[PDB]
Design a protein around this ligand. Structure first.
Ligand SMILES: Nc1nc2c(ncn2[C@@H]2O[C@H](COP(=O)(O)OP(=O)(O)OP(=O)(O)O)[C@@H](O)[C@H]2O)c(=O)[nH]1
Ligand SMILES: Nc1nc2c(ncn2[C@@H]2O[C@H](COP(=O)(O)OP(=O)(O)OP(=O)(O)O)[C@@H](O)[C@H]2O)c(=O)[nH]1
Ligand SMILES: Nc1nc2c(ncn2[C@@H]2O[C@H](COP(=O)(O)OP(=O)(O)OP(=O)(O)O)[C@@H](O)[C@H]2O)c(=O)[nH]1
Ligand SMILES: Nc1nc2c(ncn2[C@@H]2O[C@H](COP(=O)(O)OP(=O)(O)O)[C@@H](O)[C@H]2O)c(=O)[nH]1
Ligand SMILES: [Mg+2]
Ligand SMILES: [Mg+2]
Ligand SMILES: [Mg+2]
Lengths: 51, 432, 431, 14, 437, 433
């Protein structure tokens, strides 16, 4: 045991290391919902008459 | 045409810039790689410049003396959005030192910073103002932003130089030389700034703990709410509305005397999405929400001072009828004290654009919003607090050899104390 | 791209640095053979603060192993992480210091110091922006206490701008340790006062108390002691090594913790710290971390901090935490222990947050404390110095290898001035 | 050596 | 019919020729074997290549290059490279031994027997042409073949061809970066003996192109291939008006008469804009105002002398791409408003503007971005007197102790040639001073 | 007309005069022989030179001391034929840092001959403006003999303005131990006979040359060059034409309130490195601000602790009176430049057309504008206070007094000098309150 005792600071000398910082964990790609609040036929008729 | 250029200086400034450019991209529908998503306008011209192929680079300069935070911006999701040269980084920081950020390290960075500002301002037709986001805490903030504003006042003329500051708390402090840095920056930016929106981290903590119902908040939430503040400031330069208040005359309608450019701030549709729609947020309700001592951005009671002038920026479906019906009910209160020489002390600007919710934030997608900015005399208590702390340390030569050995005459501290004492006397003779 | 160069000197310094380069290689994913067995890009983002790039994917630590004896150098070479060091910065003598400050400073310790400065000069000019120097040594030894301080003096002469921190092991209050212990400690601290920027005093009996009571280890073990010291240094330099919400490097710590130039004797701490069988039984919240940090029996320099006031406190937190809890915890401890802080400096707390904990732990927190309670250390050392100075014991060796009474008295008066100014700043009122 | 110690000290005491 | 002859001499000249003939082949669609690709049917015949290549009747386009050097390594590398079929076998003139960094050895020795071969080759390439406009002579002032043989060849060309425009592209020695110690002697001698024979001498500093490629290209380790490709872009922007349509076309004769005021001040400074990489060209607009303002930036020059220590005498802008004379004139007005850019008093309209419609062509495997507009700045400043003064100072220090003079004396140069060259450049510096004041 | 006699006494005065006359020749271009360069209506040299015969302009200066070799570099150097040999007055034994030795002894054998040479110069002077006496307060022949010459000239010549250039003992960077004795002994006997004393120490010039000049090894030579630039900026209006010309007869009545407060502070701007001048064309408002910064002062005395009495602005070159007006207006509206209450208007500007002349081989660069601000501020009471405190704790246990007693000065003059300078401190306090 001359090198030291395994563990001592943390028991889990495993699980690799975490890769996420605060800014990359919070400031992510902003996802927007596509829940279709307008209507398919109204949308199609709008683009057709606009064109 | 009404372009506005932002300088995010210091680590606090860089993080607030990372929040507010996310908010600006969300507001103008800009993807993180700089592109509009297909087509389905000019409101992006105040913050972005169209390249020609469809890419919109921002009008921002992110400068910091230490690495890893500009590097984390370069590594994060807003990597292709920013131009590589406008993310200026140094090798060695100032390390919480006005002398290091103003006299030794900042001298070899200010030339490149001013060159980038020159390029961005030359690529602008009708520049309105400089939004300088920094922290009074120390280092790349307190000192380098002071040097930058000195050089900008030498170079440019009557251009607006609005600053956002992270002015320290009465109790919360993450530094020891913080009163030194604040008192040395409020000496040198007092003749070089135009409007100083100071916010206080303790007050934002209380706001997001009591109103947004987050018991475990962070700097991301703080910077997003400050981003909402600055977006409400600059919404009139980009979105049309009933009454538009731009930066060139917000100062005229706010500050009476030149060295009183220290307003507070207040955003108050600040409620979480869980409560949100049970409530019936109206113009009068958000007006008395703004006129509340517990809702202010700075830990200072406005009931202890008088209101010299106020400016409310309304956003959404707000109409002038209940705007000036609400401000009259505000004026008919005993608690809201006004100074005798300003009978008409309100300036409001109504904008048609609703606020943009952050998909991953904590604000609710409200229909209407308001940003109060009040030039009150209650900030004299904060000035007295820092002056007391400065005298308490400076009476026995605490932490002065660092500044002296990195190069600074000892009389600069005395001159700064004189300037802040004169500021206290200015506020006292205004209040009387 | 700041760089810290490590300068293990003496048997104690070599043994401590052999564990330091174990912990900051397993925090960067560097195997003993020298490659990168990591996963995150954050480990390779800032690996140049301690490792020079070698040929292939190899990384070589920027450390100069110095000793006047070959024994512990061979032990370091044969142990784990011993093949990672370059076989050129293995500077070693053939005589030995004999645990003598005079033999370390004005004898063959001053003969090898030319090659030591040559190696340090090469490894410091092979950089782009040097942050500074990190010296590990013991005050009551030979070349660590002697030639180490000589190396400090030469480097401070050559580069009087960069940071230079010294993780000095201080001799114990009890037992006896070396017999020329307080002579060596005196003559080392006299040169530590005017040549270093910050000194971390580490006490073996304080480490023994922590290991026996908190970790509940039957065998205390020098490897475990060096592991604790190494974790303390890693928590010190984690702001340079990894990003975070609120960075604070060594110079920022020195600025926020050193009010007056001859007051840079710190008391380190690191308090995610439990017995190995009760690690899963205990939560790792921010207030409980603060409670373990602000404890006199968790301190690593003896010198009970309740016997005096704190000048400054620095706290570096590695984890994914809330700044609100951190700020309210420091406000709470400051308001509670109001009599244990100097009144003339408000808010005696510097906060740093690095959002990368060490491997295994989910939130660590390390502690640095500048306080008036460190004056008891120099009071005791001056007490044994005058006790065996009024009897002229063991001074014949120092006069034989060169140095004598007048600079002995210079060192003694230097500690007396240090103790008196610490007492003055303890008992000084506001108005 | 006590008189020399009290002579060269910046803050002499006792 | 618009015709120009390129004479590459020296190792620098040959390598610059390597980097520019690939660019000419890419611009005119010539694939490296010397032939046009199949399925190339188009109206008009695509006859824009006659300024560099000459069609042989069978589809093979032999160039008009006079690649010459005294030592066979680099020229044989060209002969064994990819353009082996492209270059004519009796066009890569090679010797046995080099001049070995010696102006005397290049001007009075083993250099002076391939002179008749190279003059016969220039004669054949000249009467093959019918409307010859200029000789672009590429070399270095470092010494040897690039100085002595280039100078002697220009001396022979002056009495062989008359008033033909002998444009020079020279690698001037850097103020600090150096390769030879006899660079001052060689450069003084070749400038003295080519002051009366050159018409415009574009000098470029390796150190200047080094820190342009370090800063703007954002690549850490460029080399001579990258420098010579950038010089190739300079020459292409110069000679694009002889082969592509433009709203305002500026050929070499109009260029020279609008550039040089007196027939001794003929050392202009070159600049290219933008020299930006792709990762920043995707971000920047790179408009006409930006590319003109990048030309007057003092650290953006190609000779290590800032123009703030001097006065602009005559400027030539050569734009390429989707540029408009209105935006050009707005840029010129902004430049004339700029305080740090000061013009000489005897030249009010000191600008010569020329637009070419063809956008610049990027080399595959190169580092320059695909930009839709560019500008070549060719200025005449009196700030080159500092470079002349540094070179004169080095020459005075080396000639005070008479070091290295025995090599030139033994190879055949008279000792008084150094004194004559010294007095000639002293007169040139006096001329620059009296013009500037 | 408008002649002026320069008297350089002491080693410091001699070296300052060497630099000064080099600058004077390069301004009024005269070869070291004393001739003229073959003529490239100009009698502009007549302030400082005298045309004698066929082009033999000799300086109107007296290089006087008591110690050899130091006028011998002048006698054997490049300016060996310019000076008339009787003006270069030397001695045989030095005064050796002793005011009593330079006053009541060996300086007595030279005062008559130097006064004869002063009389011979003043006879050629047709309308003498005054004397410029260059020395140091360190001690010896620059102290005692200078004080004796001041007394004898005040006896002989009446009013006859006697501007006194003095090297004040610098606070920390200092080289002599008897300076607190010698300087107070000079001030006690010079306070009633001088009219205006420019004191400029050495440490402030060292700081100026460290910061502004960007050089690390200046010696005494360019210190004397800066002092030469100061005296040229003083006496440039008597030889060159300008918009506003000020002589040596109005400078006293514009900066001397009472006949004891005559110790102004000389500053220069823009002092600039020769290797760094092209970056920016230095503006008039900026160089007035640079004069009024508490770092370009040529004496180590920050003016932020003393209210200004009056100032002389000395613009020289390409200066416009509107730039003057704007600069002085900004200075007056500044708060750290607080003036005294009883002197509401407190300036006198002088604009000269001739630009300052750069010396080849020097450290300064060619500038189209310059200004030499001289303020009679109350801040110099701290320099007097530290001088008196040095003198008090040095004269406490009668240190070094026996040398002066043996030389001839008795005990009472030390106390008289101390009480006279204490009265001067009380006068500054009464003025400042
Ligand atoms: N609101 C908010 N404040 C921040 C944030 N990050 C840092 N701060 C403030 O910044 C202060 C610390 O000083 P910094 O701004 O980091 O110093 P700096 O500008 O980076 O300059 P250096 O000290 O040299 O690194 C703290 O008191 C915080 O209040 C943030 O993300 N949001
Ligand atoms: N810009 C640039 N310069 C080059 C290049 N190749 C050589 N040089 C220059 O050439 C100089 C060396 O002398 P050379 O021109 O090779 O001599 P030479 O013309 O081959 O004649 P000899 O000395 O007889 O071989 C160096 O100082 C370089 O600046 C190149 O590819 N690009
Ligand atoms: N500015 C400047 N000051 C000088 C120079 N030489 C000497 N001094 C100053 O003169 C002081 C010493 O007094 P001196 O003037 O040399 O003495 P002295 O007038 O020759 O009389 P003695 O001391 O008897 O030789 C020093 O403290 C210096 O500050 C110089 O060349 N330039
Ligand atoms: N913490 C710690 N202390 C040590 C270690 N090895 C030695 N020491 C201490 O160092 C002191 C002796 O120093 P020494 O090794 O002889 O110094 P040297 O002569 O320069 O090599 C002893 O009092 C020990 O308490 C170690 O591995 N860890
Ligand atoms: Mg920071
Ligand atoms: Mg060759
Ligand atoms: Mg003398």
């Amino acid at each position: 045991y001359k090198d030291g005792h395994k563990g001592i600071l943390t028991r889990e000398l495993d699980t690799a290391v975490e890769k996420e910082s605060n800014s990359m964990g919070s400031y992510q790609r902003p996802a927007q919902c596509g829940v279709r609040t307008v209507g398919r036929k109204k949308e199609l008729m709008e683009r057709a008459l606009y064109a | 045409m009404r372009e506005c250029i932002s300088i995010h200086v210091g680590q606090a400034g860089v993080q607030i810039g990372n929040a507010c450019w996310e908010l600006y991209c969300l507001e103008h529908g800009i993807q993180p790689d700089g592109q509009m998503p297909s087509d389905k306008d000019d409101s992006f011209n105040t913050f972005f410049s169209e390249t020609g192929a469809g890419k919109h680079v921002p009008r921002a300069v992110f400068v910091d003396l230490e690495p890893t935070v500009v590097d984390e911006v370069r590594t994060g999701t807003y990597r292709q959005l920013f131009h590589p040269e406008q993310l200026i980084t140094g090798k060695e920081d100032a390390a919480n030192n006005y002398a290091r950020g103003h006299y030794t390290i900042g001298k070899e960075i200010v030339d490149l910073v001013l060159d980038r500002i020159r390029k961005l301002a030359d690529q602008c037709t009708g520049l309105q103002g400089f939004l300088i986001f920094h922290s009074f805490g120390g280092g790349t903030g307190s000192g380098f932003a002071s040097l930058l504003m000195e050089r900008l006042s030498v170079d440019y003329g009557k251009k607006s130089k609005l600053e956002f500051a992270i002015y320290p708390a009465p109790q919360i402090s993450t530094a020891v030389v913080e009163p030194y840095n604040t008192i040395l920056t409020t000496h040198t930016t007092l003749e070089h700034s135009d409007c100083a929106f100071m916010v206080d981290n303790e007050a934002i903590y209380d706001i997001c703990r009591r109103n947004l119902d987050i018991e475990r908040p962070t700097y991301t939430n703080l910077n997003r709410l400050i981003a909402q503040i600055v977006s409400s400031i600059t919404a009139s330069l980009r979105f049309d509305g009933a009454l538009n208040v731009d930066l060139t005359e917000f100062q005229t309608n706010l500050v009476p005397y030149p060295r009183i450019h220290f307003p507070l701030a207040t955003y108050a549709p600040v409620i979480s999405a869980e409560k949100a729609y049970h409530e019936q947020l109206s113009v009068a309700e958000i007006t008395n929400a703004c006129f509340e001592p517990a809702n202010q951005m700075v830990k200072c009671d406005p009931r202890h001072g008088k209101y010299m002038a106020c400016c409310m920026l309304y956003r959404g479906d707000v109409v002038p009828k209940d705007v000036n019906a609400a401000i009259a009910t505000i004026k008919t209160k005993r608690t809201i004290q006004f100074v005798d020489w300003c009978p008409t002390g309100f300036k409001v600007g109504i904008n048609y654009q609703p606020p943009t919710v952050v998909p991953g934030g904590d604000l609710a997608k409200v229909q209407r919003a308001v940003c109060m900015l009040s030039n009150t005399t209650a900030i004299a208590e904060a000035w007295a607090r820092l002056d007391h702390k400065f005298d308490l340390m400076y009476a026995k030569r605490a932490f002065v050899h660092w500044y002296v050995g990195e190069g600074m005459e000892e009389g600069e501290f005395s001159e700064a104390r004189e300037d802040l004492a004169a500021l206290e006397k200015d506020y006292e003779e205004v209040g009387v | 791209m700041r760089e810290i160069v490590h300068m293990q000197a003496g048997q104690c310094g070599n043994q401590i640095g052999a564990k330091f380069w174990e912990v900051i290689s397993d925090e960067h994913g560097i195997d003993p053979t020298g490659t990168y067995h990591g996963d995150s890009d954050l480990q390779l983002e800032r690996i140049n603060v301690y490792y020079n790039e070698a040929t292939g994917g190899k990384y070589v630590p920027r450390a100069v192993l110095v000793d006047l004896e070959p024994g512990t150098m061979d032990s370091v070479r044969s142990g784990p992480f011993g093949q990672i060091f370059r076989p050129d910065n293995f500077v070693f003598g053939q005589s030995g210091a004999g645990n003598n400050w005079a033999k370390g400073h004005y004898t063959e310790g001053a003969e090898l110091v030319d090659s030591v400065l040559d190696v340090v000069r090469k490894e410091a000019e092979s950089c782009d922006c040097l942050q500074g120097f990190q010296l590990t040594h013991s005050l009551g030894g030979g070349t660590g206490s002697g030639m180490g301080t000589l190396l400090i003096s030469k480097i401070r002469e050559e580069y009087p701008d960069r940071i230079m921190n010294t993780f000095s092991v201080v001799p114990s209050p009890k037992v006896s340790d070396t017999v020329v212990e307080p002579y060596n400690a005196t003559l080392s601290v006299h040169q530590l006062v005017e040549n270093t920027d910050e000194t971390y005093c580490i006490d073996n009996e304080a480490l023994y108390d922590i290991c026996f009571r908190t970790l509940k280890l039957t065998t205390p073990t020098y490897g475990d002691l060096n592991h604790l010291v190494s974790a303390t240094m890693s928590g010190v330099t984690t702001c340079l090594r990894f990003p975070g919400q609120l960075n604070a490097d060594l110079r920022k710590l020195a600025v926020n913790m050193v009010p007056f130039p001859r007051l840079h004797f710190f008391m380190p701490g690191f308090a995610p710290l439990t017995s190995r069988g009760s690690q899963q039984y205990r939560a790792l919240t921010v207030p409980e971390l603060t409670q373990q940090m602000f404890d006199a029996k968790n301190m690593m320099a003896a010198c009970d901090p309740r016997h005096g006031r704190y000048l400054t406190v620095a706290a570096i937190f590695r984890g994914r935490m809330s700044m609100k809890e951190v700020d309210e915890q420091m406000l709470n401890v400051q308001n509670k222990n109001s009599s244990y802080f100097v009144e003339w400096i408000p808010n005696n707390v510097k906060t740093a947050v690095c959002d990368i904990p060490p491997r295994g732990l989910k939130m660590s927190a390390t502690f640095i404390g500048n306080s008036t309670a460190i004056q008891e250390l120099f009071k005791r050392i001056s007490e044994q110095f005058t006790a065996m100075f009024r009897r002229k014991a063991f001074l014949h060796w120092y006069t034989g290898e060169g140095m004598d009474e007048m600079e002995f008295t210079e060192a003694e008066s230097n500690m007396n001035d240090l103790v008196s100014e610490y007492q003055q700043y303890q008992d000084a009122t506001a108005e | 050596n006590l008189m020399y110690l009290k002579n060269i000290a910046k803050y002499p005491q006792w």
